[PDB]
Amino acid sequence: KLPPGWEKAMSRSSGRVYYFNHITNASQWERPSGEPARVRCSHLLVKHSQSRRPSSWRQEKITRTKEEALELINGYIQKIKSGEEDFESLASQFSDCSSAKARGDLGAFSRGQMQKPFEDASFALRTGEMSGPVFTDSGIHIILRTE
Ligand SMILES: Nc1cccc2ncccc12
Ligand SMILES: Nc1cccc2ncccc12
């Protein structure tokens, strides 16, 4: 019935059904539509004080809490979904990964190369789809599958 990792849920505020993916943390109103050797993704990383390396090109010492980083991620997702901002623009300005300089593009990769929650979300995304918040040892990611 539902593509890999999708479940039905019910909105607390409106009562209408929606769909949630427990691998990508994506959520949407419409019923989801429905593996390759390699996928290509971009990402926006927000680091926090418990990141493996709590430092980035934006900040020599990253001090924000994980909960604060999640709030920032959620705000970026809202602006991307409304069209107020583009993913690529937010990645270049605010991603704590050096890949910010390439609008978040990481290039193409296979299974076994990236951290596992990132890998699993990337491969479960369909081409053009965006994840919700994905947690790794690096921080919290928004992932966009481009190929
Ligand atoms: N909602 C949350 C997000 C991220 C970290 C947290 N830590 C403690 C309690 C709640 C949290
Ligand atoms: N750290 C990085 C990882 C993957 C791709 C990148 N592209 C440009 C700059 C930094 C990158």
Domain boundaries, the chain: 1-32, 38-147
Which of 25, 50, 70, 74 is the best mutation target for the ligand 1 pocket, counting ligand atoms within 8 Å of the beta carbon and taking the most?
70
Q: Side by side, which strands form the sheet with 6-10? A: 6-10, 17-21, 27-28
Residue 67 alpha carbon to ligand 1 centre in Å: 5
Q: Check if 31 has its Cβ closer than 6 Å to any atom of ligand 1.
A: no
Q: Check if 126 has its Cβ closer than 6 Å to any atom of ligand 2.
A: no
Q: Name the architecture of domain 1-32.
A: Single Sheet (2.20)
Residue 43 half-sphere exposure toward CB, CA atoms < 13 A: 32
- DSSP 3-state of 128: coil
Q: Which amino acid is at 54?
A: P
Residue 46 alpha carbon to ligand 1 centre in Å: 15
Method of determination is X-ray
Residue of 54, 57, 53, 49 whose CA lies nearest to 99: 57
Helix crossing, 66-82 with 87-94: angle to 10°?
150
CA distances to 52, 67, 90, 99 from 129, in Å? 27, 25, 16, 19
Task: Give the resolution in Å.
Answer: 1.5
Q: Give CA–CA dist 44/94, Å, rounded.
A: 7
In DSSP notation, 57-125 reads: SS-SS----HHHHHHHHHHHHHHHHHTSS-HHHHHHHH-SSGGGGGTTEEEEE-TTSS-HHHHHHHHHS
Residue of 136, 129, 140, 142 whose CA lies nearest to 39: 129
Q: What is the CATH number of domain 38-147?
A: 3.10.50.40
